[PDB]
Amino acid sequence: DVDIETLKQELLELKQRYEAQQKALAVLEQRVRQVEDQ
Amino acid sequence: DVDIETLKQELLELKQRYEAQQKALAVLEQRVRQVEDQ
Amino acid sequence: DVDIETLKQELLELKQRYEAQQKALAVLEQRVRQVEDQ
Ligand code: NA
Ligand code: NA
Ligand code: NA
Ligand code: NA
Ligand code: NA
Ligand SMILES: [Zn+2]
Ligand SMILES: [Zn+2]
Ligand SMILES: [Zn+2]
Ligand SMILES: [Zn+2]
């Protein structure tokens, strides 16, 4: 309801945040490369 | 074995580590910018 | 509705993902430094 389902909801929310950070790591990685060959 | 309070505690712990990694991404982003602009 | 073993399993999987991201942040950090003190 509002407790074990709360845990499950929050874990999914954190998975999304994980995924957003992987995408941001990749953006920053491309920014470093442009600096590197520029 | 499966302690629900333990699960909730560990989810909160991982949320704080998420938060710290966001701040570290931000630190690295500014360092990249320092090298882009100089 | 919620499978508690599954929740524990997924929390540990997300923990491993966090640990890998920490290591990836560190790799990118070294790359930036390489550009910086070059
Ligand atoms: Na920033
Ligand atoms: Na930002
Ligand atoms: Na920002
Ligand atoms: Na710039
Ligand atoms: Na070290
Ligand atoms: Zn622990
Ligand atoms: Zn099951
Ligand atoms: Zn899984
Ligand atoms: Zn460092």
Numbering used by the authors:
A (entry chain C), B (entry chain B), C (entry chain A): 1 to 38
Please quote the authors directly:
Full-length FapF possesses a large N-terminal periplasmic region comprising the first 70-amino-acid residues. In vivo secretion assays have demonstrated that this periplasmic domain is essential for secretion by regulating the release of the helical plug.
Using a combination of X-ray crystallography and solution NMR spectroscopy together with molecular dynamics simulations, we show that the coiled coil forms a novel asymmetric trimer of parallel helices. Crystals were only observed to form in two zinc acetate containing conditions over 3–5 days of which only one was of suitable diffraction quality [JSCG + 0.2 M zinc acetate dihydrate, 0.1 M sodium cacodylate (pH 6.5), 10% v/v 2-propanol]. As the 1H–1H NOESY spectra clearly show three tyrosine residues in distinct conformations that are not exchanging on the NMR timescale, we were able to confidently model the core of the coiled coil with a single buried Tyr20 side chain per trimer. This leads to an asymmetric arrangement of two surface-exposed tyrosine residues within the trimer and the configuration allows the buried Tyr20 side chain to coordinate with a Gln23 side chain of an adjacent chain. Another striking feature of FapFCC is the presence of the buried polar Gln23 residues, which are stabilized by neighboring Gln24 residues through an extended hydrogen bonded network across the core of the protein.
